[PDB]
Amino acid sequence: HHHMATPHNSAKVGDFAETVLMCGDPLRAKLIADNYLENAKQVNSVRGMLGFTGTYKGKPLSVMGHGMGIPSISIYAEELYNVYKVKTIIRVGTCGTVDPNVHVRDVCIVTASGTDSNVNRMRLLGHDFPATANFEVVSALVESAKALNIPTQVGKAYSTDIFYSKEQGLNEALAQYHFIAVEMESAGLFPIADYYGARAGCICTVSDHIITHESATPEERQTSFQNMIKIALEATLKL
Amino acid sequence: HHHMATPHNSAKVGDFAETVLMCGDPLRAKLIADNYLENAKQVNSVRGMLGFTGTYKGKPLSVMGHGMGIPSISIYAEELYNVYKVKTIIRVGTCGTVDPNVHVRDVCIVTASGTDSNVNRMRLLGHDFPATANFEVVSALVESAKALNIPTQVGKAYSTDIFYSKEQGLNEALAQYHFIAVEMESAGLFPIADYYGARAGCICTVSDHIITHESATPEERQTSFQNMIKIALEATLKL
Amino acid sequence: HHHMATPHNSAKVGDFAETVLMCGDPLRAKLIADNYLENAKQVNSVRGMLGFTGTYKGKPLSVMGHGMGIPSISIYAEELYNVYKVKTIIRVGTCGTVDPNVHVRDVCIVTASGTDSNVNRMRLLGHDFPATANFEVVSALVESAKALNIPTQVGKAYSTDIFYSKEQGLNEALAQYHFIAVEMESAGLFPIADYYGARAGCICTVSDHIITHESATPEERQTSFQNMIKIALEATLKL
Amino acid sequence: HHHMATPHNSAKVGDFAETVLMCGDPLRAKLIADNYLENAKQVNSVRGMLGFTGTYKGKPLSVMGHGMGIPSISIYAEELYNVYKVKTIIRVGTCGTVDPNVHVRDVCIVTASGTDSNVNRMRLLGHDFPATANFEVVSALVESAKALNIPTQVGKAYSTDIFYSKEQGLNEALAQYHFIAVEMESAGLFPIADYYGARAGCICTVSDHIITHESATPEERQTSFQNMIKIALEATLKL
Amino acid sequence: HHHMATPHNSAKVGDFAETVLMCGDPLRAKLIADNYLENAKQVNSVRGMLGFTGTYKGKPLSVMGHGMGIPSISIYAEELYNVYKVKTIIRVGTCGTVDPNVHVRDVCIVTASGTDSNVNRMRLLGHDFPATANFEVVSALVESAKALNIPTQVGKAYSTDIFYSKEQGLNEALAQYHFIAVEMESAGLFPIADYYGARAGCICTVSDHIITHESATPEERQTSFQNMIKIALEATLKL
Amino acid sequence: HHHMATPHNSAKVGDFAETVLMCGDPLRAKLIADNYLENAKQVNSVRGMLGFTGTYKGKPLSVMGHGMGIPSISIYAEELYNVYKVKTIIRVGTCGTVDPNVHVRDVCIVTASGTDSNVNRMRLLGHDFPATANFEVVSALVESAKALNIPTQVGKAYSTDIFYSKEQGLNEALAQYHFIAVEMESAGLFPIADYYGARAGCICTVSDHIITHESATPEERQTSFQNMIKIALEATLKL
Ligand SMILES: Nc1ncnc2[nH]cnc12
Ligand SMILES: Nc1ncnc2[nH]cnc12
Ligand SMILES: Nc1ncnc2[nH]cnc12
Ligand SMILES: Nc1ncnc2[nH]cnc12
Ligand SMILES: Nc1ncnc2[nH]cnc12
Ligand SMILES: Nc1ncnc2[nH]cnc12
Ligand SMILES: [Cl-]
Numbered sequence A, B, C, D, E, F: 001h002h003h004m005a006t007p008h009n010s011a012k013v014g015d016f017a018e019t020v021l022m023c024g025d026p027l028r029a030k031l032i033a034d035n036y037l038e039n040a041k042q043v044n045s046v047r048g049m050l051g052f053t054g055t056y057k058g059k060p061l062s063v064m065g066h067g068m069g070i071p072s073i074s075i076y077a078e079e080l081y082n083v084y085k086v087k088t089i090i091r092v093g094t095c096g097t098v099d100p101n102v103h104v105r106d107v108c109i110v111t112a113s114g115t116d117s118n119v120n121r122m123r124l125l126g127h128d129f130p131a132t133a134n135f136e137v138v139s140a141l142v143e144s145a146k147a148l149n150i151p152t153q154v155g156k157a158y159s160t161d162i163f164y165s166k167e168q169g170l171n172e173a174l175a176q177y178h179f180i181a182v183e184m185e186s187a188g189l190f191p192i193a194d195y196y197g198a199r200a201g202c203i204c205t206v207s208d209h210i211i212t213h214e215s216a217t218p219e220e221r222q223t224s225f226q227n228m229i230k231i232a233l234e235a236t237l238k239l
């Protein structure tokens, strides 16, 4: 038995760096730690949601899984900002696209995220509350990709509660308004950062074109991941 | 590289029994398999979401984690009913309560679940769609608890997207209408079972009284879990 | 002039039994009293909404009309639970069906009811509040039908405010999710029972198949009614 | 057994006049017929919902009960306009008031009605559809009251689904915006008249002041009714 | 620098008459003042939103532009009723129609207005609040047109936030329920008048048939305007 | 009579530059043209909504008023992007703030805007659609202010339909989530730019602190305007 600083995390207060990368898959968090962090230690394994703290190019950095969907990321991010006193979270993810000018393997940097969830209406008296990335975070991601000569798409994501959509007309509306990324979490993250006066952003790679059915092979997803993670890691040095 | 029958599960079609127990924590799924299943094999580990198939008292039974929140359980349950041809899912969970006559350690059998999620409005043209447990499943749980001489509370749950509620008046309304369990997933499960012409139910143990702040110790949570899981396992023999 | 214990009921406090059957048509309430109750007296005739109190197999039982729609049943049921101190109400009704495996003359026992009304959102801070039958009531109805060798369908109803629907896609969604009964009142009854810590259920007979246009003749509706009412009456002995 | 032209009315097509008065209480419909119509015959008694057709000062006129709430009046009025080819319906009712300058016994002529029902949003793509009385009907009521030297209040009603309101702040908002009448049906009537290219209005007498708790005695309600019904009857001669 | 009695109006308190005509186009307000008012002075030019005060047939009358859309008219009308102590506002506008029996050049007198705006839900606890014209104002407009032998259509308007509609099915629903006028402001005006215990109405001329594409030429719009404005001006003498 | 390319703009197609600054007050548009544009001509005066086209430091640039509120800016911006083929619109405005660390005279660069309007839900199947500024526009504004040594606040705006708010709790929620600017138009602009595959942004100066009641004097508003307009003009050179 270890003392539990939160109901979902056994890390001691102070065991997370002020900057954290988060991805849905805890096994990918372990890969990030093993392949890119130094001075690394595992700080959480509750519910299998692996988290790690170390350094990237000497600067403190943590990485942890967030699970799938807005309610899951909301638990983990609320705890990180509130109990662990984290200042910056960058979600590092995968996404689909409907945009005709976005292609599988593209790197998407998210400026704001729409949603079919109610969580943000509940925060703003039933009104429209845009889940908005912090500008310094967006800029750090854009500038890191430029320095690395990796092209990026910059624009809106859409975070859905329903992976297995049955909703007629949704893809056409997302395309009409140039949503570049379809995923499941970022719209839950940004308002929590706001509540705590903290910062968040999101970068994703396109695994699937929802319209054309193009899909990245395993090797292509590894190459896309390597590009995205290098951008995110370099961006942390500016944050 | 293994063939992926779904984007989130590496099990081969046929590797799940027709009856599945699911809990949020994949590590608890492993405990259930190790302590209660025979003939057991691990059939999934994608995203750390451990799943297992074996037998309980000779009858095929699987157990798998579902993660936290409606979007997470929706992914896993949709796949189980659709691709894996599962017929019955029982969620085996923990919950809070606001009800003045429900106490920590109590076992709650869920007849229907409210929610603050939009997922069910989206299925029924914006209207009220009650997330409703199958009657045969509820009855099997009630009758198994009676045969085991374990008291139960039977009634409504409330599945929220927001573990860290900031909503004034919610607890008072839940208590006024005798909601017995507050959790995060069951309202997403029941309508998916309906879509597939299949069955679902939920049984939870009370870990926390949201009003009085009573909370179960680790030893008390183990005892509650042992009672709940025996009820669920015996119920599968009737299903 | 008689003293009015409520604005809609001239019965004296205590003039209703703790268990009440209610149907939409007050003339059917009179038929139930005349054909199945002993020791019977009329206790209300305000607005023509006939109500009666007597005994069924020696046990106190009342029967009263509720009129058509959620607002009408809400008035009468609120008064019964609050002023008349009733403990159990069973709605005994007729319904349509869209379900391909439900047929005209079938007896449907309701576990929960959806709706297009706002009344339940207004009770639960705008959220989804499932109108849920009490499990002991559902079980008593199921077991009484079994003892009488009368087949039943058990599952969800949908209570609409609009008998003359013009809503495209509604029937297809109701069928997709296996709603067995379409009627107009039960979703208003169950939350009122909850408010008062009391019990409610509903049993209906299928008069019409909304898809195939099959419709019960007058003789068939009498036979269906005789089956349903015997089930409900026998169930009261267990409640 | 009689042929049923609708599921709720045994009147033969043509048995209703083109102008119909409707009140909630079928027993009050009988009183109106007995005391004010000549050449009168009962044309419906299904569900006890008495309806009558005769003449008032030589002009064809019917009167029928509508029951309590929007779903009930919607059934009866839809049938009257569609099957019975009625052209004008005037609801003749009772109401409460919150308005500080409206008093018990006052006669209120309704120009439009708000609601907490969803029925009108469902007709207009989810938008705000004002339930609006026909101007010729309103004018006929106003001018008849003037000729009879009976004072009237003219303005908005509010039609609620919930007689037993638990809603904090509702009365204060209704008063702030000068709603003169609180009742349960008119907002359902006016849009149905619109659908059929027909006309509707409403006149009510104040039985209760919701704020001060003033309440009309039985004798006072009879006097108020006599004033209101004379206004409505005289108005039919202009319609 | 002049003292600003409101943030949008430089008129001194008392510089507006108790009765005000308002139109969207400030240049049309100037035309009305120049061609129909005597004793006229310009009292506002902030934001170009010209307003004037003078007399019509000896009676004090003002005219001012209101701009386009509910938020714009709401600013100006709130200020007029609150700061300037205005008692009656008549909107004098143009509109489209979908109604098959309404034609270009017709004069429409508005009894109530629907909307796709949220402003009225926000005033009435999320419910349906009909934006309703004052009956004395409607009657004054109707009677003035009759005395001038100018035909009118009387009925509902629909005030939209979106001139450039992309909404499938809207026109068909508006036609089904006999909305006579499509415009952008009146639904915002009427509830503000209510808040202040004051009066409002609206009269419009049909510039365009939304279905047939008929459109008034410039000369036809001038003739329609001359008819409408004479009706409105004469109506002010009765108010 | 001039040909009207749109119902609200007499400019000939081609008479607007590809980049346009817009402000609410047409008189401020004239001031911008007179004081900062060369080669300038007035291209619109319909409804007094002055618009001008010229050059700023040799590059084509237009400036036009947009009026007050989402419906007004939506008309003008839709026309500019669609008929006039504009590529970039920057709203140059004033705002209030509730943020404790934002002060009167501050320059706010908007990354996204919330709203109480329905216009964006109507574009995205009822879901949350964030009104999001284009990143290149935001960056151009930020970098221009830096080069000019003018401090800026960067973050979310809130666009309301109701200048005269009566909404309890709104300011506290806006402050909790660090909304920096309260205004009335930007949330309508950004989705229209998206529809046309075009770009938009917004920069405002704080005229009023909604909490402390601090308010800029006329001289202070002129100084703030001079800072903001120089930032916007310099940003156009990068766009
Ligand atoms: N198509 C998709 N939909 C939702 N979330 C996703 N994450 C990756 N691809 C996705
Ligand atoms: N208090 C609580 N709220 C939500 N989900 C829970 N699961 C267990 N306890 C819970
Ligand atoms: N088709 C139907 N729709 C609604 N309520 C009903 N009650 C009986 N049949 C019905
Ligand atoms: N107070 C009230 N509320 C609702 N409907 C009514 N009808 C008469 N009085 C009423
Ligand atoms: N077609 C139309 N739509 C909206 N407002 C209008 N005003 C005049 N014509 C209109
Ligand atoms: N306080 C305020 N509210 C809304 N819009 C504004 N524009 C400038 N100040 C404002
Ligand atoms: Cl996924």
Ligand SMILES: [Cl-]
Pocket: B068, B163
């Ligand atoms: Cl949890």
Ligand SMILES: [Cl-]
Pocket: C068, C163
């Ligand atoms: Cl019916």
Ligand SMILES: [Cl-]
Pocket: D068, D163
């Ligand atoms: Cl009543």
Ligand SMILES: [Cl-]
Pocket: E068, E163
């Ligand atoms: Cl217009």
Ligand SMILES: [Cl-]
Pocket: F068, F163
């Ligand atoms: Cl303003």
